[PDB]
Ligand binder design. Structure first.
Ligand SMILES: Cc1cc2nc3c(=O)[nH]c(=O)nc-3n(C[C@H](O)[C@H](O)[C@H](O)COP(=O)(O)O)c2cc1C
Ligand SMILES: [Cl-]
Ligand SMILES: [Mg+2]
Length: 109
């Protein structure tokens, strides 16, 4: 599959997605119109582990890189195990500019 990633802007309210790769559209079944401007949490559902979601919150708070695995859902409701890579990206002034989130689909341990 093509590379699945989104880029968020934490200088906007609730860190919305401002770019979604074609691979992300493919992986999640959503259209670019249905993704842009929302927080990445929209992929979570009932089976998503809340301890892992907390770990994500904390990494985003402390602006630190993290890799977690967690259950997400496609538009039509299919489960998929998301090995999610989050990385802060700072400008040359050392100010947080974006977050990049890269998803790999599958059961990875
Ligand atoms: C760039 C980026 C990509 C993200 N991608 C995903 C994702 O693919 N799946 C997911 O469940 N959460 C993803 N998140 C996590 C949620 O956006 C959110 O940070 C997490 O649920 C914790 O915050 P909350 O407790 O307010 O929901 C991503 C966050 C960022 C910054
Ligand atoms: Cl967030
Ligand atoms: Mg939540």
């Amino acid at each position: 599959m093509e590379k699945s990633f989104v880029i968020t802007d934490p200088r906007l309210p609730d860190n919305p997605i401002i770019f979604a790769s074609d691979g992300f559209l493919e992986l999640t079944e959503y259209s670019r119109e249905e993704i842009l401007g929302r927080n990445g949490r929209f992929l979570q559902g009932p089976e998503t582990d809340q301890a892992t979601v907390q770990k994500i919150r904390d990494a985003i708070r402390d602006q630190r890189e993290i890799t977690v695995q967690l259950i997400n859902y496609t538009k039509s409701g299919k489960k998929f195990x998301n090995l999610l890579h989050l990385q802060p990206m700072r400008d040359q002034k050392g100010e947080l500019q974006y977050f990049i989130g890269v998803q790999l689909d599958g059961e990875f341990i």
